[PDB]
Ligand binder design. Sequence first.
Ligand SMILES: Nc1ncnc2c1ncn2[C@@H]1O[C@H](COP(=O)(O)OP(=O)(O)O)[C@@H](O)[C@H]1O
Ligand SMILES: Nc1ncnc2c1ncn2[C@@H]1O[C@H](COP(=O)(O)OP(=O)(O)O)[C@@H](O)[C@H]1O
Ligand SMILES: [Mg+2]
Ligand SMILES: [Mg+2]
Lengths: 274, 274
Amino acid sequence: HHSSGLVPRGSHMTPDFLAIKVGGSLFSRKDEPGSLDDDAVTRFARNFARLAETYRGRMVLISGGGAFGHGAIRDHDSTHAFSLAGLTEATFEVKKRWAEKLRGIGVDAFPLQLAAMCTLRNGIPQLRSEVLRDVLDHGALPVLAGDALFDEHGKLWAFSSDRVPEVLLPMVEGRLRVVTLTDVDGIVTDGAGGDTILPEVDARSPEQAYAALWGSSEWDATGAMHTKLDALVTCARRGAECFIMRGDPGSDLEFLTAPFSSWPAHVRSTRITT
Amino acid sequence: HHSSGLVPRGSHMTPDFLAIKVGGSLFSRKDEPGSLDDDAVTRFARNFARLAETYRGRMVLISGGGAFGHGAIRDHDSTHAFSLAGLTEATFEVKKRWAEKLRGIGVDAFPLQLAAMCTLRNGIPQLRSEVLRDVLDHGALPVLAGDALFDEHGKLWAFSSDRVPEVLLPMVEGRLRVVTLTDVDGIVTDGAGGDTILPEVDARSPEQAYAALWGSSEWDATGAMHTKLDALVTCARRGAECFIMRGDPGSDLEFLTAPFSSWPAHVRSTRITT
Ligand SMILES: Nc1ncnc2c1ncn2[C@@H]1O[C@H](COP(=O)(O)OP(=O)(O)O)[C@@H](O)[C@H]1O
Ligand SMILES: Nc1ncnc2c1ncn2[C@@H]1O[C@H](COP(=O)(O)OP(=O)(O)O)[C@@H](O)[C@H]1O
Ligand SMILES: [Mg+2]
Ligand SMILES: [Mg+2]
């Protein structure tokens, strides 16, 4: 036994940190190049702004790649992994669009290139720049996304926005809450369209959640729901309280500041914890 | 006296590392939003590619901001320094354009956001990400530019591409050569259009070079030739061999691999050294 700080945890406790990921499904048609739904971005931005005021210096916003990101991966030459470099430019564009919009409504939103801050070592992302912590300590809102990351052999890999919360794990003090907004209400069990949402998944033994999953579409290059589950199990096994739930641009999100047991009764999600 | 490695230096010696900065003047009209001269970019790229093959893992390309960068600074609200955040998006675009072009001709060019890697402390830029060194060690070509950088108090500052070589100084082993390509042949002495180029400046006492300088235009927000001189004096006082010289998109640049005393006789520059 190595000693560590005892962190009080539970459905009664308020999060110390929010990592909110917004799926591309919610503001982009993957099929349509350069699709960004500015109305969706605008409306979501307003809701993210309120969260960012409360979680000042205690939140990151993570954007999916949409048409920009999936397109970069679709269109690269798999025979030279370096052609994935275009992915970093593509996901920068999406971070830019979020950050611009947020700054227009008074949020100190700053896009950061994950590829400039993180590399892979034995498959595990490694935060290698102190700048993310400084930005948060200045009270700003980092806008992040997935990226093309170098490994220790110099090979580029496509690293989904869904996995970005993993990079926060050794950095974030106290209770991390990770919320992945998507186009489904959570992990649906008993049907490749629907039956019922699985309300709780135990990250120590999530075999039933994995049993529920179905395929990625043709348009999807980063593994859809399986990649989400893998990332959120990873985060939950390191103490995070994680959620898959439905995004909606005008939906109020202030309940994401609140302890889970105090959430409104209408809110549906899959919660992943240990 | 603290001991350090004795580095052989002189006009007879070949550089171990090349930092090539390409001024916005050379591929953008600052006055014209979104001006990027694709023919200039294409032609320069071809010449930079040959350098990058020889200096594989031993070179950075640094782009000026042109219309994108100067525009971001022109158009920000000086009453909230955070509105400078748009600068990081603007100079990312320019890095993207270079990197795209270079990759199209077989160079492993990867844009990196300086703001994600570097902060200011007591006015001195501090490299805070290990990713730049890794990228170079993988044999890739970092494409850099100026940026909006956070200081230790959370204030954003516009940091010119001209100063980017300063960030390399504690990282680069051996002989660094810094070449700033601009729209003049060097530091002109005896006239606010021309008289003669100052061929050599001693960084230990460069008072005559500073005496030669004239103003920034209306369009220029990062201090024109004075900022170049300040950056290159800084680098030279830490051992770099620095050059201000004229850029031209089709000009062959292979002589930039070569010891200074072996350069062609037609080449004009201001050389700054200690
Ligand atoms: N068991 C499941 N429950 C819910 N969604 C699932 C399941 N299995 C696969 N999926 C798919 O995962 C999709 C969400 O992932 P994805 O398409 O990548 O969206 P995002 O844009 O949020 O990353 C859903 O639209 C659904 O089609
Ligand atoms: N003594 C000098 N010698 C040469 N150029 C000078 C001098 N003083 C000022 N300058 C100005 O500096 C300019 C180059 O800096 P700048 O406009 O910022 O170009 P860049 O795009 O390379 O950064 C020249 O075009 C010139 O007008
Ligand atoms: Mg996805
Ligand atoms: Mg300049």
